[PDB]
Amino acid sequence: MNELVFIDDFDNHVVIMSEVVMRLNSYRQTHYTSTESGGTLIGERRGQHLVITHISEPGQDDVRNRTGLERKGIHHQQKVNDLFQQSNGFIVYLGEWHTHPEDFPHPSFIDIKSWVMGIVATEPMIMLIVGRKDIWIGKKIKNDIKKLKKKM
């Protein structure tokens, strides 16, 4: 439940702080009745490194099903809006996260297609999938996506 650190091929770090990990793992689809959860990844750009400081959480505003999710709530943008204000422009939107009803997850064709069409990544972005036992995390640059590696 501490921090998680992921690295790319250039050793650019992607840091998920401990409070974010606990929030993410609280939406693990541990039961067969559990529906999909998700939101935005919000954090800090420090050179080529990224630090995930906050996330937006699911609300009843969102369409949540067992193997599908529609992040529609207006509160997601407000979290990005307010964190930008409180941080004087240092805590910014960085990507998207959602859950998968599987132990060790990987993105599907719908996940990849929606990411290339959804997140604009003129600057680096992060995608995250919360599995029942572990996390899949990837980095987006324009239209290209690549899985990160867990730092030894």
Binding site: E3, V5, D11, H13, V14, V15, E36, G38, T40, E44, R45, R46, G47, Q48, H49, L50, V51, G68, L69, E70, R71, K72, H76, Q77, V80, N81, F84, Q85, N88, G89, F90, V92, Y93, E96, H98, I110, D111, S114, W115, G118, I119, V120, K151
Partner: peptide, 26 residues
């Protein structure tokens, strides 16, 4: 320590809040 290299670079500021895409399906 594992995350220390990221915190050794000063953060970047952005001009305005980002406009997240409406309806993110997955």
């Amino acid at each position: 320590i594992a995350a220390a290299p990221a915190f050794h670079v000063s953060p970047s500021r952005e001009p305005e809040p980002r406009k997240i895409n409406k309806t993110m399906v997955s």
